[PDB]
């Protein structure tokens, strides 16, 4: 069943066979940034174990130009072979003329040559603006999952591991990094230098790397002799400080937390220009977007130093959780990409506590169970096959939601035995390959009345969506059931092993019961006022309190709301407005708890509650809900004015309170308060006026911009100074700006500039089209765009990559009307061309049908509950 030039090709299956494992790469890579293209060999040691007329491997995009196969025993210098091409499997066949002999070792040998990349995939080419406007090429690689075989043939699924010997040609002007460091490097007859690197590890072919650019860089050695530098454009170098800083102490953690060194002599950390995603952790040279490791203090803010911080240890973490132990299949990405996650908490918590990351923590799974509510949310580890089916894998699933399941997992094994659990799982399986099943029998062992954390987790990782805890407290005994929480009902499968976590009135002692039953009963000691299940907020569930249980935590808020945990709050605050959604509580339950909040000074609380209010503020304000949006505001802005005017247009002050300020600010600017319109519009007037020269406070330079944005002299002069910009954090927040305009043909040549992708790159085009269609004058714009023009889209990046996902998610979720559903219904039928399908079409149906329904349940509500403050 096969093509191309003419017969019948050995295999069928779109995996590879186990009969050929590869040991070692010599692989010689010759790129060219004049004529953008490469011509390329490789040399395969291989190790054949049943006897076999075909060697089968991957390859793409690739003319492939000789083809020999030596050996040592057998054949010494050496056979030629015929090549067939599969490209619907991306696979070649090398065709040998003998029966090869088990356990003897081969060398393939192939010469190879293609055009640089023109996207974001395998080896392409990137571009950067110099400080005197020049523009410069750089070569770089991206290989996760399933585009190694873009730039070399190879074994390219991640159990196949082996050593790689890389050696590059270039010309003097630039530098040649990969994984490993430079041995040496050889002047050749023309001019030519060739550079020559330490063979690595063993290791995935997805890690593999190389880069060919005029950088320079910034270094420094970690207590563990590792030789760190931060790779960045010439004129951007002042900008690698912080993370030169942060990746050693990173780096020193996470060798004394797992207790196992980093093994290679150096690690770079490279900030690419065009970078799809925000980073990739290939080992000893990780690449990172501009904006997940440059930091200008001077335009950068607290938040920025948050996330770059985030990234690096979320990529250094990946050293060990990845590339030291790989899983044996994309069905199981989350072993990598959870733990990652996971240990950006507990790396960041070590080495800057002043950075308050784990309330930062909560957010980010807070955030994930608005999504796993739905029907058509999905399990962490699923099955997985196709070409499109694995990039379905990358979101925030398999991600977040893995990364708080584990954290669930911290609190109800310790920190010191989970520690211990992960030391031994990454010590068995260094330099190897590990399945779920292995990661759960370390954690368990570490005699004998059993862990079985593997009945635990079946249930959190194997299982699909978020279980809801209804608790009823009849006097001093209490009525537990577990539900699946969905966001539209009145689930016929589902059940969960999921530990609980209760505190009281009585005493702050926390209890710890399990549970693993549809339903389940528990007596108190005591009788007492409230119950409070999930301390912390540090379980990955939610509470409904049936009964008088509600009410008695509201008035103890609004009574003396120190009496519960700053956790345990934001957490009530959360699942409150949820189980509005639910259909379990009545709005006004919810909005009647937003009262305390003007004596609340944890920003975590605050900040949250707001993010509510002003949620509904925004859905009002994208319908023309006038006379609730006019009363939200008024309410939002009389209501916390204390807590507004109390902010300083600075950066003084902690990283909460930072976020804090920079929120409320931007809410008060937002909903149009004179004063802060004034005190914006001049700090733009004077920035302005002075040409670049007065300093914003970095904590409100998006509201400056964004004000400012609103005459079309500031949004020219913005637009301007966005493409002489050094700092593409600033960039970032002048996009944001710009993206705020009123104007219909200043927000569309926004997109046109995304599209053309010279001034405004294309790797930002998903963010700046969701930046636009959030706001009611660009909404639809923004939607008639993402139709009109779906085949245009689709040349610049590939369904389903993250930049695809965006662009339909970030254009259509938003909506809550009846007609709008139908025209996003239309719009994803007429997909049935490759098209449908993806796993969002139908996650936005679901998003815009909740949005139908909270609208229609909840509404009525929202109006008279407002007009009841106003008297
Ligand atoms: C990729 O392709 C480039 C051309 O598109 C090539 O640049 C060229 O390099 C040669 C020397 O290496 C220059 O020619 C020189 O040599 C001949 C004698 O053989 C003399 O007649 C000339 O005076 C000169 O000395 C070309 O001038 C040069 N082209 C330019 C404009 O720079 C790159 O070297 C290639 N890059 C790599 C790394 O493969
Ligand atoms: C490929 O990588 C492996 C490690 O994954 C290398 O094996 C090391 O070899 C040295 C010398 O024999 C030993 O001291 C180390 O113990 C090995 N590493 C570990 C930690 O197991 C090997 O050198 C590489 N192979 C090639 C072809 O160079
Ligand atoms: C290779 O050998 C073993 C027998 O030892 C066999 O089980 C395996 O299937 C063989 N590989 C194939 C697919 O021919
Ligand atoms: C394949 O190309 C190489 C280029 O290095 C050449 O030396 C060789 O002669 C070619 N193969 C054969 C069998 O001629
Ligand atoms: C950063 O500033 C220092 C001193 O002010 C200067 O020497 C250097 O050129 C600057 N670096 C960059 C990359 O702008
Ligand atoms: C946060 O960090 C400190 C150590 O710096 C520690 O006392 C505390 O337990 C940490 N919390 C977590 C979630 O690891
Ligand atoms: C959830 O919703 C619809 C209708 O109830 C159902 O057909 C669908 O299969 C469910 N979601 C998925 C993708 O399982
Ligand atoms: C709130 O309760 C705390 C703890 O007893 C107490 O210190 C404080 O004075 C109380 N304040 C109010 C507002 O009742
Ligand atoms: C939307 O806003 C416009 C401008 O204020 C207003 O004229 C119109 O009444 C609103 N649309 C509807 C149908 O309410």
Request: proline share 4%; glycine share 4%; with cysteine.
């Amino acid at each position: 069943p096969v093509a191309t030039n003419g017969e019948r090709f050995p295999w069928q299956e779109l995996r590879l066979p186990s009969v050929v494992i590869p040991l070692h790469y010599d692989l010689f890579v010759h790129p060219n940034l004049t004529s953008l293209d490469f011509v390329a060999s490789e040399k395969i040691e291989v190790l054949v174990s049943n006897a076999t007329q075909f060697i089968i491997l991957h390859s793409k995009d690739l003319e492939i130009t000789n083809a020999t196969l030596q050996s040592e025993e057998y054949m010494k210098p050496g056979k030629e072979l015929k090549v067939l091409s599969y490209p619907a499997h991306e696979q070649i066949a090398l065709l040998v003329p003998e029966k090869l002999t088990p356990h003897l070792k081969y060398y393939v040998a192939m010469d190879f040559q293609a055009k640089l990349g023109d996207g974001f995939e395998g080896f392409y080419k990137s571009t950067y603006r110099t400080l005197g406007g020049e523009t410069r090429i750089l070569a770089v690689t991206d290989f996760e999952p399933t585009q190694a075989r873009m730039a070399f043939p190879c074994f390219d699924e991640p159990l196949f591991k082996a050593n790689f010997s890389i050696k590059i040609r270039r010309e003097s002007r630039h530098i040649a990094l990969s994984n490993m460091p430079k041995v040496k490097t050889i002047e050749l007859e023309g001019g030519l230098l060739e550079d020559h690197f330490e063979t690595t590890v063993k290791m995935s072919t997805y890690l593999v790397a190389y880069i060919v650019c005029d950088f320079h860089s910034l270094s420094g050695f970690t207590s563990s002799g590792v030789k760190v530098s931060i790779y960045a454009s010439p004129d951007k170098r002042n900008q690698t400080h912080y993370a030169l800083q942060a990746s050693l102490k990173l780096l020193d953690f996470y060798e004394k937390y797992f207790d196992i060194y980093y093994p290679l002599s150096k690690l770079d950390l490279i900030a690419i220009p065009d970078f799809a995603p925000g980073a990739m952790e290939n080992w000893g040279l990780i690449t990172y977007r501009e904006t997940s490791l440059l930091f200008d203090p001077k335009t950068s803010s607290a938040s920025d130093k948050l996330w770059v911080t985030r990234v690096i240890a979320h990529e250094l973490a990946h050293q060990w959780f990845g590339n030291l132990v790989t899983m044996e299949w994309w069905n199981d990405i989350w072993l990598k990409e959870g733990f990652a996650k996971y240990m950006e908490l507990i790396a960041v918590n070590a080495t800057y506590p002043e950075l308050q990351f784990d309330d930062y923590f909560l957010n980010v799974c807070f955030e994930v169970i608005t999504k796993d509510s739905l029907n058509s949310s999905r399990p962490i580890s699923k099955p997985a096959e196709t070409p499109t089916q694995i990039q379905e894998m990358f979101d925030e699933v398999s991600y977040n939601k893995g990364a708080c399941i584990l954290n669930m997992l911290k609190d109800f094994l310790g920190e010191e035995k989970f520690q211990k659990g992960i030391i031994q799982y990454l010590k068995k399986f260094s330099y190897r390959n590990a399945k779920n099943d292995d990661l759960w029998s370390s954690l368990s062992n570490s005699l004998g009345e059993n862990a079985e954390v593997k009945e635990m987790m079946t249930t959190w990782t194997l299982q699909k969506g978020i279980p809801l805890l209804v608790v009823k407290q009849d006097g001093c005994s209490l009525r537990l059931q577990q539900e699946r929480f969905l966001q539209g009902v009145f689930q016929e499968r589902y059940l969960w092993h999921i530990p609980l976590t209760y505190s009281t009135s009585s005493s702050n002692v926390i209890h710890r019961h399990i549970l693993k039953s549809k339903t389940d009963t528990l007596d108190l000691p005591e009788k007492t006022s409230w119950v409070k299940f999930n301390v912390d907020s540090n379980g990955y569930y939610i509470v409904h309190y049936e009964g008088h249980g509600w009410d008695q935590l509201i008035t103890q808020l609004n009574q003396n709301h120190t009496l519960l945990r700053p956790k345990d709050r934001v957490g009530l605050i959360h699942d409150v407005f949820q189980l509005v959604g639910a259909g379990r509580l009545t709005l006004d339950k919810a909005l009647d708890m937003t009262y305390y909040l003007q004596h609340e000074t944890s920003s975590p609380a605050l900040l949250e509650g707001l993010s509510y209010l002003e949620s509904f503020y925004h859905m009002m304000d994208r319908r023309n809900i006038s006379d609730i949006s006019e009363n939200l505001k008024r309410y939002l802005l009389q209501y916390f004015k204390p807590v507004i005017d109390r902010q300083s247009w600075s950066d003084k002050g902690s990283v909460w309170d930072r976020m804090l300020r920079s929120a409320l600010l931007k809410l008060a600017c937002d909903l149009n308060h004179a004063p802060c319109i004034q005190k914006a519009a001049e700090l733009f007037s004077q920035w302005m006026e002075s040409s670049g020269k007065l300093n914003i406070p970095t904590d409100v330079l998006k509201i400056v911009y964004s004000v400012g944005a609103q005459t079309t002299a500031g949004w020219n002069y913005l637009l301007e100074q966005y493409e002489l910009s050094m700092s593409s954090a600033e960039q970032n927040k002048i996009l944001y700006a710009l993206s705020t305009s009123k104007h219909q043909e200043k927000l569309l040549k926004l997109i046109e500039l995304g599209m053309e992708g010279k001034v405004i790159k294309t790797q930002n085009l998903a963010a700046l089209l969701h930046a636009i269609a959030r706001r009611p004058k660009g909404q639809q714009l923004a939607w008639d765009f993402v139709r009109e023009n779906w085949t245009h889209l689709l040349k610049k990046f590939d369904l389903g990559s993250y930049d695809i996902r965006m662009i339909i998610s970030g254009t259509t979720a938003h909506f809550s009307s009846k007609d709008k559903l139908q025209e996003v219904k239309l719009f994803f039928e007429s997909l049935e061309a490759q098209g449908s399908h993806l796993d969002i079409f139908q996650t936005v149906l679901e998003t815009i049908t909740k949005n139908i329904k909270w609208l229609e349940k909840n509404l009525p509500t929202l109006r008279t509950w407002l007009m009841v403050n106003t008297r």
